[PDB]
Amino acid sequence: MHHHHHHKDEVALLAAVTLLGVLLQAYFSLQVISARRAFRVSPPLTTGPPEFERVYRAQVNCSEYFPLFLATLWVAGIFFHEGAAALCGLVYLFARLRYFQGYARSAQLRLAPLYASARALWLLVALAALGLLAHFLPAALRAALLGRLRTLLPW
Amino acid sequence: MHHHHHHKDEVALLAAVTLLGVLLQAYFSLQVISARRAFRVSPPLTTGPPEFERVYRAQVNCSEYFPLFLATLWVAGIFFHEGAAALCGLVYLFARLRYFQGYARSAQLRLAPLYASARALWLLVALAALGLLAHFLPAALRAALLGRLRTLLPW
Amino acid sequence: MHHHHHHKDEVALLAAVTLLGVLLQAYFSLQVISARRAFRVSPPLTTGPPEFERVYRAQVNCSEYFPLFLATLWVAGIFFHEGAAALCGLVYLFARLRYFQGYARSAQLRLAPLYASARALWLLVALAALGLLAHFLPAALRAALLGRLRTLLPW
Numbered sequence: 228m229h230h231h232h233h234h235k236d237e238v239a240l241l242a243a244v245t246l247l248g249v250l251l252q253a254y255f256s257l258q259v260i261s262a263r264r265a266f267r268v269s270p271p272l273t274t275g276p277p278e279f280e281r282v283y284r285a286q287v288n289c290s291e292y293f294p295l296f297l298a299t300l301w302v303a304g305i306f307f308h309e310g311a312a313a314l315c316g317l318v319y320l321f322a323r324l325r326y327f328q329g330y331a332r333s334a335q336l337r338l339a340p341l342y343a344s345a346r347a348l349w350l351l352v353a354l355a356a357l358g359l360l361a362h363f364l365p366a367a368l369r370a371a372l373l374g375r376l377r378t379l380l381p382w
Numbered sequence: 383m384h385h386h387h388h389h390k391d392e393v394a395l396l397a398a399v400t401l402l403g404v405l406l407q408a409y410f411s412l413q414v415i416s417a418r419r420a421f422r423v424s425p426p427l428t429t430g431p432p433e434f435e436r437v438y439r440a441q442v443n444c445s446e447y448f449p450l451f452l453a454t455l456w457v458a459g460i461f462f463h464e465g466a467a468a469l470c471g472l473v474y475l476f477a478r479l480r481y482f483q484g485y486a487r488s489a490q491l492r493l494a495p496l497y498a499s500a501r502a503l504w505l506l507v508a509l510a511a512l513g514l515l516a517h518f519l520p521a522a523l524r525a526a527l528l529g530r531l532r533t534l535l536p537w
Numbered sequence: 538m539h540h541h542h543h544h545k546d547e548v549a550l551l552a553a554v555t556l557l558g559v560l561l562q563a564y565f566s567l568q569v570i571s572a573r574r575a576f577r578v579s580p581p582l583t584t585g586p587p588e589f590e591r592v593y594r595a596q597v598n599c600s601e602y603f604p605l606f607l608a609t610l611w612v613a614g615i616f617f618h619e620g621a622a623a624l625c626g627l628v629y630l631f632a633r634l635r636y637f638q639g640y641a642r643s644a645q646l647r648l649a650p651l652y653a654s655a656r657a658l659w660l661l662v663a664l665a666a667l668g669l670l671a672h673f674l675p676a677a678l679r680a681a682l683l684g685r686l687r688t689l690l691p692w
């Protein structure tokens with residue numbers, strides 16, 4: 228409720244990549260709705276021609292991974308480096324766009340961009356992990372050394 | 383780890399709408415479990431009578447959009463205006479409750495609240511985008527003017 | 538953009554539980570891909586032998602609840618108590634790991650860890666709610682008393 232400082236400028240690139248991700252997900256959704264018309268599939272019900280089922284499944288898989296992407300983007304961006312996390316996020320999202328486009332054409336064409344999206348997501352995971360390790364490991368190593376010291380009142 | 387200030391009071395309405403959203407999602411889930419009994423559908427397996435499939439599909443669609451709603455709510459609430467973002471969030475969630483209730487009765491009755499939920503989500507997206515533009519565009523325009531200036535050492 | 542303080546040390550346990558949750562979700566996904574080979578189910582398409590359908594459905598359900606878990610973890614951790622929220626989060630995630638493992642073996646074996654995951658999630662919801670109530674209820678009670686006072690200019 229103010230606050231004479233804000234932390235917006237520390238997360239704005241994460242927020243922009245997040246919004247791009249929302250926009251891409253919305254687009255995937257609109258493509259499924261468009262495929263429902265092209266290939267005559269009525270709600271509820273997610274079975275129909277192969278071409279429809281591939282578009283449907285591409286959207287479902289993107290949707291499933293999307294919170295994982297968001298969680299890791301934010302943890303990596305806060306604990307490791309904002310710019311690095313955001314760049315990796317852009318690469319992931321572009322890879323997901325290529326995955327969806329590929330998959331819609333052929334199951335097999337989903338594979339190369341799928342691998343690219345996994346490499347970008349795993350890099351985000353590794354940056355998040357390194358950032359958290361940097362945060363916790365020094366204090367933990369110190370507390371353990373201190374307990375050891377201890378010895379003491381001797382030597 | 384303290385900190386003689388906190389930023390809770392800047393995000394509390396976003397946090398409350400978020401929690402309401404979790405509660406609504408939990409409710410949708412409990413309704414699917416209840417429909418599984420009413421219409422005799424046993425896990426795993428998500429096919430059964432039309433009435434079950436509509437309830438199932440309403441929950442699935444709400445679930446799919448729920449991270450999009452959360453992401454945009456937080457970005458809009460931080461970059462644009464907390465109160466506005468929270469209000470739009472409440473409207474979205476009420477619209478989703480009406481969507482789920484409608485859909486359970488008839489595919490066709492899902493449509494009006496579906497359109498209401500999309501208008502509320504797109505307004506959140508537009509507030510998020512405007513907030514981010516307000517954040518990045520002045521510094522970007524300035525850096526570009528400065529490079530232009532440049533000219534200079536003349537005129 | 539600096540900032541001579543950071544709020545990382547107030548959310549690091551939430552961030553670590555979040556990352557563990559991402560890792561567990563990634564694992565569930567890899568298990569579905571592994572079941573697709575074991576039980577010969579090719580993409581798109583999520584129907585096959587019972588053993589495959591159980592593994593698939595366990596992943597889907599974990600995926601569906603995962604944003605709910607994340608949202609509530611963060612709200613509870615910020616508004617109620619970071620350590621308590623993180624502990625409950627670990628219990629939820631362990632319960633989800635046991636749920637997935639159970640379900641893969643038998644529908645019936647998913648049930649005990651399912652109930653454990655629901656108790657942990659509902660405790661997170663209750664901590665989030667109590668934290669938000671603590672935040673809003675005093676100011677609200679005060680504003681209402683002040684309007685009452687009022688009376689006044691008399692008595």
Ligand SMILES: CCCCCCCCCCCCO[C@@H]1O[C@H](CO)[C@@H](O[C@H]2O[C@H](CO)[C@@H](O)[C@H](O)[C@H]2O)[C@H](O)[C@H]1O
Pocket residue numbers: 257260270493496500
């Ligand atoms: C840089 C890019 C950003 C540009 C910003 C512009 C964004 C505008 C995108 C348009 C989004 C439209 O939003 C979409 O509307 C259609 C209606 O037409 C809805 O569609 C709904 O109604 C139709 C027709 O009754 C049904 O057949 C359909 O099954 C149902 O889902 C979608 O559920 C909603 O998601």
Ligand SMILES: CCCCCCCCCCCCCCCC(=O)O
Pocket residue numbers: 234237238297298301302304305306308309543544545548555607611
């Ligand atoms: C789903 C995960 C959401 C996580 C959001 C956590 C935000 C809490 C901390 C905000 C303070 C900003 C820290 C600045 C670090 C940086 O430079 O990026």
Ligand SMILES: CCCCCCCCCCCCCCCC(=O)O
Pocket residue numbers: 233234235238245297301389392393452453456457459460461463464
């Ligand atoms: C999934 C997106 C989660 C985003 C959470 C980002 C929170 C980081 C910044 C917190 C500082 C609070 C900023 C105050 C602005 C306001 O008035 O709402």
Ligand SMILES: CCCCCCCCCCCCCCCC(=O)O
Pocket residue numbers: 388389390393400452456544547548607608611612614615616618619
């Ligand atoms: C999906 C929900 C994401 C929510 C992320 C909200 C983070 C905004 C506030 C960050 C300031 C840190 C507050 C410290 C309280 C604490 O001790 O945990």
Ligand code: NI
Pocket residue numbers: 229230231
């Ligand atoms: Ni002041």
Ligand code: NI
Pocket residue numbers: 229230231232387
């Ligand atoms: Ni201040």
Ligand code: NI
Pocket residue numbers: 384385386
């Ligand atoms: Ni102090």
Ligand code: NI
Pocket residue numbers: 384385386387542
């Ligand atoms: Ni301080």
Ligand code: NI
Pocket residue numbers: 539540541
């Ligand atoms: Ni300085």
Ligand code: NI
Pocket residue numbers: 232539540541542
């Ligand atoms: Ni400062």
Ligand code: NI
Pocket residue numbers: 232234387389542544
């Ligand atoms: Ni601060």
